[PDB]
């Protein structure tokens, strides 16, 4: 049973970052399922492989 | 089948740094022999004898001084350097007038000490090709990137070379004296101070580990002639060589506020010389020490390291030499050197100082992304400059580069080849 | 998987034999006087001229070691180069295009299907069992000094030695000229370098035993006696003065290349210091070089000198342990290789 | 970013590059995931752990196969922690 | 089962200027009956940027374009331009006639000697395509480029609490876009 | 591409060499166990003498970038890496992926027209005057991610095998 | 020319070198 003060400390502390490339719990959890329904994508590094749906602040601010 | 590959053409490259020359073929990896920038001589008998083999000299003679060569990068004593040359590719067993020789030298060089040069590779040792390339140029061609902004950190001169798609920009180089001769002549001072006499390593033949600061037993083997000053300056030279390889650490401009922990932590650490005195060295020596090669806070001249300006009120130490560097380029380019920073020399081998010259060049450069490359292998740290004029030779398009001793003697005037051809 | 060939090129001599043995098939000179090959050809002095194909770690002249590697082949091995691979040995820092030649020569002319170069120094440090420490190789005509760094041998720290066995026995040749006793045939030459390999031991201190005898008889029916140059010639390895070459001494060589390398390697280099080639095999040298590197050597650190039995062919039975392994088998120079590529390959993987 | 399902691309598994070189073809690598790093009177300068692991830390800090955080934030030029 | 034999030969004319015989050796795979293989490769990218030039001659059609500019300074700077492939700031940096020569300078009169140049050349039969179309770019101005080199100074030269909340600005507009769906979504159930 | 070249190799010899090192201390230890098996001597007569991976397009990789000094702690996943793989199958699954990569930093583009490489800070209109505005470092490389195949996702009629009935 | 030693102290001559290897 760690004391109060000893909490308020550890949230000053920072946090251990998780960087992007990094298996982060949400993946295809490895080729568990069917090789059929897996398909290998070479990318270049410099191009995402995944991207966040969204619009421009100018088109949220209008409407 | 597409020619990815490199022709190879069996080119001897040679590099004369300030403290140490690397001679080496063309395609290999590493120098084959690097001999320090030192020629002995003796002339105790009515002829005179040369001594030029690295560890010839180490050894007592009767009659025997060191005389330095490579004193700020430009080179001196020319009559001792083509006997040092010519020793050294004897050494090496080169068989002259079948393979080109590329020399390596400094941003700064006299013509005249170039046009000898020239003369003595294409007339005397008989040498079909050769070529001049300028050292920063060479190591951004060792380290890869064709654009990027070398900051060498060597032991007599700190040199910033911005360089634009592979050629040196030659009035944007900034040279400051405050170097590894600075940090030798500063710990000297310090060792002064504290009253430690050094002695050499010949002269030490039985001694016993004492680590108190007070004179330590050291059985002394005395030769009947008598020792020159410049050997006793050469071989203590080897010694403050390990004893900055070990001692020395920087710290982001916090000594003051640690100055009184470190004494209450005792972090101290000894070095033992060959006389066996294990002298201590508080860390707020050995940080201030490391420091002064940022700021030259030291008030007490230097012992002959004076005041100096670029290309030589106060001295500007690396991190505002860097600044004012990056500052006089043109904006249209200046986030590309940025960018890429090369930074060589074998004193970056001390621990921090790169990741402090990073912390002081992102904060004193706001919004520009500096980061600094530098290199994990030591050999390549060392001798990025022969790695760099290996590549160049075993290039496939360079050859049309390569100076005949026909074409020397038709353009005649030095000063025509080197303008174009370098 | 076949039986990898080794054959280790000295300067003495050759040697050569298979791998996993613990001892090579034949050993022979490997000098050649062209008017045969070999010993035999060495007995007939009057026609042909002895002459050494190799010298100082440098081939002088292909044309005669074409034949020396003929007679190790197809007159004292026997084997079939034609199929199995070979393993050679060469003395570090040696220029490119002596190794772009021995390599085109061998693939060329025997057709070798696999053919590997490495360091006959490191191949002595794989002996002894420990994969790092400077090796003291001293031949019969080039002492090397390699810090060897999980057998990578560090490019810079590499220190050569013009102090040799033939240098030593023409010290003593000298010496035993100056007692009174002039030798003049080459036959006589090795006969004072047996009598030199037989009771000659190397002194504690130079000076003490100078203040304070033997005697062999020689082969022809007459003996010899000798009193101080039973500790006067290994002391001339320890000061070259005598020998009149500006070469440094064995114990200042090596401490010059232990502190040229990095700081951080030296203390396992000091502890794990191996000494090798039939030179230094010199009775009593293993107590006074470390003697001498410790008075020179930092006290905190600990000097183990550690001088094997085996020292004559250490370097061969590194290089036959090396091959016999399993993992080197991939670091062959295959054919193809050489083909495509070149000789320049060797340069490359070697 | 927000919603916490299931999404049909992972991490990458491995980086590679198909280089030709002298030798022959080659594929280079860096780790996908960067390690933890640091993963190993008075003291003579040589016996120093300490120093020893500050010399290869510091050796090894600005050429590495991945970089470090080094986060974007304008928390560092404001003289202000980032919480702040 | 045996190998082609490489060999060591003399190789040449790396396409060199000048017609010196430098002959450096380099390995070849086969017997070099293919020796005097003139095309020795790497003189496939002996390539050399192509810019006409001006003789004493045609100055008079130069005569009408601190400037102070006269033959001996435009020459130079052709004989530059012709030398180093056309980069810029390492031609200024070797510049050497007189130092008050500034980038756009150097880059205006370039420009306007160059294309006065080529109009003058297609004047008899007029000029399309790859030609018109660089004529076209070479319609600049020196003006802009100094706003603009003066702006970006501008920008580079900001305090460090400004451009931090620059960088904070962008960094929470991002974070606000990329939850648009999802705010757009309940702003229309509400 | 001859820089890059001579960076891999330079890291590709110490790992091999570090290697060779680590299997001649293991022999000394385990024992001749990992020795070859050896096969039988073929000795010619005299005779004879009188009329007188490791194989097919290796593609060897190279180490990541830690050099020397940090290297003979051997950062491995679980065993030694694989410095030399000759078979080339690469399990038949992953031969495509080695031959259908582009060769990065090549000299010549097959002789395609000429085109040149230029800087990519020159590619970029804006100046990189921000750290934001950082373009791609451009350092050829292709990652490799596996996915869910849409088709998958795709409806698919129901399968299954009927009891005793149930059928039609 | 004869064979002095040997020493292959196998900590595991047991055929499988990963008996202890693993
Ligand atoms: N690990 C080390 N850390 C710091 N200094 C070192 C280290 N090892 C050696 N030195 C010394 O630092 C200096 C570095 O010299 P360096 O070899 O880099 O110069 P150079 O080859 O002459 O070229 P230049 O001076 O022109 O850059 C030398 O005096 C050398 O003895
Ligand atoms: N029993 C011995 N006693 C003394 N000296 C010996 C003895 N055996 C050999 N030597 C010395 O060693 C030499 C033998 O050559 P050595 O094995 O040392 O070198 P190598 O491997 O043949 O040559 P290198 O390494 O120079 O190519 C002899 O000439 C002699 O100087
Ligand atoms: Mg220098
Ligand atoms: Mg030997």
Redesign the pocket.
């Known amino acids: 049973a760690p004391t109060l003060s000893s909490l308020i400390r550890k949230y000053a502390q920072d946090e251990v970052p998780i960087r992007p490339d990094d298996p982060t719990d949400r993946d295809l959890n490895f080729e568990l399922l069917d090789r059929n329904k897996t398909i290998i994508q070479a990318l270049p590094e410099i191009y995402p492989h995944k991207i966040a749906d969204s619009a421009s602040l100018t088109e949220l601010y209008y409407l | 089948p597409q020619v990815y590959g490199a022709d190879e053409i069996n080119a001897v490259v040679l ?1 004369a ?4 020359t ?1 001679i080496g073929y063309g395609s290999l990896d590493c120098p084959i022999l690097n001999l320090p ?1 030192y020629y002995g001589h003796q002339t105790k008998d009515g002829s005179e004898k040369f001594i030029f083999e690295e560890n010839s000299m180490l050894i007592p003679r009767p009659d025997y001084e060191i005389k330095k060569i ?1 004193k700020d ?1 430009i080179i001196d004593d020319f009559e001792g350097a083509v006997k040092q040359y010519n020793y050294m590719f004897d050494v090496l067993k080169l068989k002259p007038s079948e393979q080109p020789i590329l020399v390596i030298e ?1 941003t700064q060089n006299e013509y005249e000490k170039k046009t000898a040069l020239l003369k003595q590779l294409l007339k005397e040792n008989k040498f079909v090709a050769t070529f001049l390339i300028k ?1 920063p140029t060479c190591v951004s061609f060792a380290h890869g990137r064709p654009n990027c902004l070398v900051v ?6 700190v ?1 910033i070379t911005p360089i634009l798609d592979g050629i040196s920009l030659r009035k944007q180089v900034l040279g400051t004296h405050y ?3 600075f ?2 002549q500063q710990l000297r001072q310090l060792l002064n101070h504290k009253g430690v006499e050094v002695v050499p390593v010949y002269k030490v033949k039985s001694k016993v580990p004492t680590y108190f600061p007070d004179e330590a037993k050291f059985e002394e083997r005395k030769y009947d002639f008598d020792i020159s000053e410049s050997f006793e300056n050469f071989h203590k ?1 080897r010694i403050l ?1 390990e004893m ?2 070990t001692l ?1 650490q920087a710290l982001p401009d916090s000594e003051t506020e640690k100055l009184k922990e470190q004494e209450t932590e005792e972090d101290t650490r000894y070095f033992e010389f060959p006389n066996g005195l294990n002298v201590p060295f508080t860390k707020y020596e050995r940080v201030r020490l490391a420091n002064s090669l940022f700021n030259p806070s030291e008030p007490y001249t230097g012992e002959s390291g004076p005041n100096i300006v670029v290309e030589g009120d106060k001295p500007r130490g690396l991190t505002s030499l860097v600044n004012q560097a990056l500052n006089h380029l043109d904006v249209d380019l200046k986030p590309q050197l940025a960018n890429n920073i090369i930074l ?7 621990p921090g100082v790169a990741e402090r010259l990073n912390q002081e060049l992102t904060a004193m450069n706001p919004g520009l992304k500096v980061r600094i490359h530098s290199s994990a292998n030591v050999i390549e740290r ?2 990025s ?1 022969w790695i760099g004029g290996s590549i160049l030779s075993s290039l496939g398009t360079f050859h049309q580069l390569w100076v005949s001793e026909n074409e020397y003697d038709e353009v005649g005037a030095k000063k025509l080849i080197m303008d174009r051809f370098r | 998987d076949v039986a990898a060939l080794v054959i280790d090129n000295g300067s003495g001599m050759c040697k050569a034999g298979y791998a996993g043995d613990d001892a090579p098939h034949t050993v022979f000179p490997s000098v050649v006087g062209r008017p045969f090959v070999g010993d035999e050809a060495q007995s007939k002095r009057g026609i042909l001229t002895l002459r050494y194909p190799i010298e100082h770690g440098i081939v002088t002249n292909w044309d005669d070691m074409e034949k020396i590697w003929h007679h190790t082949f197809y007159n004292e091995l026997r084997l079939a180069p034609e199929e199995h691979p070979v393993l050679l040995t060469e003395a570090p820092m040696n220029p490119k295009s002596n190794r772009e030649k021995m390599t085109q020569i061998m693939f060329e002319t025997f057709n070798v299907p696999a053919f590997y170069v490495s360091i006959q120094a490191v191949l002595s440090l794989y002996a002894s069992g420990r994969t790092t420490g400077i090796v003291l190789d001293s031949g019969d005509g080039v002492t090397h000094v390699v810090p060897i760094y999980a057998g990578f041998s560090l490019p810079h720290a590499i220190l050569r030695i013009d102090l040799a066995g033939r240098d030593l026995t023409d010290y003593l040749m000298k010496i035993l000229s100056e007692r009174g006793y002039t030798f003049s045939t080459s036959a006589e030459r090795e006969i004072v370098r047996d009598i030199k390999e037989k009771l000659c031991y190397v002194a504690l201190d130079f000076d003490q035993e100078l203040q304070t005898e033997k005697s062999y008889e020689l082969p022809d029916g007459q003996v010899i006696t000798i009193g101080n140059e039973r500790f006067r010639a290994p002391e001339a390895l320890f000061h070259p003065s005598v020998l009149g070459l500006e070469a440094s001494g064995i114990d200042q060589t090596t401490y010059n290349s232990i502190m040229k390398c990095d ?1 951080d390697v030296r203390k396992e280099l000091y502890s794990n210091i191996v000494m090798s080639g039939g030179t230094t095999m010199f009775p009593g040298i293993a107590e006074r070089m470390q003697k001498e590197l410790t008075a020179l050597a930092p006290s905190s650190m600990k000097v183990k000198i550690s001088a094997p039995p085996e020292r004559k062919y250490s370097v061969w039975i590194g290089g036959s342990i090396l091959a016999s392994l399993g993992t080197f088998q991939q670091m062959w120079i295959s054919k193809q290789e050489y083909d495509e590529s070149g000789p320049s390959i060797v340069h490359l993987k070697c | 970013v927000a919603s916490n399902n299931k999404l049909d691309v992972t991490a990458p598994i491995c980086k590679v590059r198909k280089r030709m070189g002298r030798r022959g073809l080659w594929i280079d690598r860096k780790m996908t995931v960067d390690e933890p790093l640091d993963e190993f009177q008075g003291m003579n300068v040589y016996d120093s752990v300490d120093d020893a692991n500050s010399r290869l830390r510091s050796r090894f800090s600005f050429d590495r196969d991945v970089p470090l955080f080094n986060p974007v934030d304008p928390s560092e030029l404001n003289q202000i922690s980032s919480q702040t | 089962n045996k190998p082609t034999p490489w060999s060591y030969v003399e190789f040449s004319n790396d396409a060199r200027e000048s017609k010196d015989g430098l002959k450096l050796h380099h390995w070849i795979k086969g017997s070099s009956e293919l020796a005097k293989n003139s095309p020795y490769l790497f003189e496939k990218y002996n390539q050399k940027i192509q810019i006409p030039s001006f003789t004493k001659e045609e100055y008079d059609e130069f005569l009408k374009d601190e400037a102070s500019w006269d033959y001996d300074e435009t020459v130079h700077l052709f004989q530059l331009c012709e030398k180093w492939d056309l980069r810029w700031p390492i031609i200024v940096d070797r510049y050497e006639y007189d130092e008050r020569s500034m980038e756009e300078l150097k880059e205006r009169f370039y420009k306007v000697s160059e294309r006065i140049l080529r109009h003058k050349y297609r004047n008899v039969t007029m000029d399309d395509k790859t030609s018109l179309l660089v004529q076209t770019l070479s319609s600049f101005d020196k003006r802009r480029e100094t706003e603009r080199k003066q702006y970006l100074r501008r920008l580079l030269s900001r305090s460090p609490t400004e451009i931090a909340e620059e960088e904070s600005l962008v960094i929470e507009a991002r974070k606000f876009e990329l939850a648009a769906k999802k705010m757009l979504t309940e702003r229309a159930s509400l | 591409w001859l820089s890059v070249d001579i960076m891999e190799e330079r890291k590709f010899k110490a790992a091999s060499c570090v290697q060779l090192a680590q299997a001649v201390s293991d022999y000394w230890t385990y024992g001749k166990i990992v020795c070859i098996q050896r096969k039988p001597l073929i000795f010619l007569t005299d005779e004879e003498i009188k009329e007188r991976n490791p194989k097919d397009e290796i593609i060897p990789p190279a180490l990541p970038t830690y050099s020397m000094g940090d290297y003979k702690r051997l950062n491995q996943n679980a065993e030694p890496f694989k410095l030399h793989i000759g078979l080339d199958d690469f399990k038949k699954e992953d031969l495509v992926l080695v031959e259908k990569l582009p060769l990065s930093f090549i000299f010549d583009d097959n002789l395609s027209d000429s085109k040149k490489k230029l800087s990519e800070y020159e590619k970029a209109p804006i100046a990189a005057i921000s750290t934001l505005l950082a373009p791609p470092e451009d350092d050829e490389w292709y990652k490799i991610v596996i996915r869910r195949d849409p088709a998958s996702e795709l409806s698919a009629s129901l399968d299954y095998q009927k009891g005793l009935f149930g059928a039609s | 020319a004869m064979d002095q030693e040997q020493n292959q102290p196998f900590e595991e001559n047991a055929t499988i070198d990963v008996a202890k290897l693993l």
């Not at chain 2, 740094?17 to 140490?20: E, T, V």
């Not at chain 2, 060498?152 to 001169?157: A, K, N, S, V």
């Open positions: 590099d740094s300030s403290y140490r690397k920038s490579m990068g400094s050292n060498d950190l060597g032991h007599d001169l040199t170097a590894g001769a940090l030798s030279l060589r900055k390889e020395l060589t020399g074998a004193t970056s081998l001390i060392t001798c400059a | 700081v």
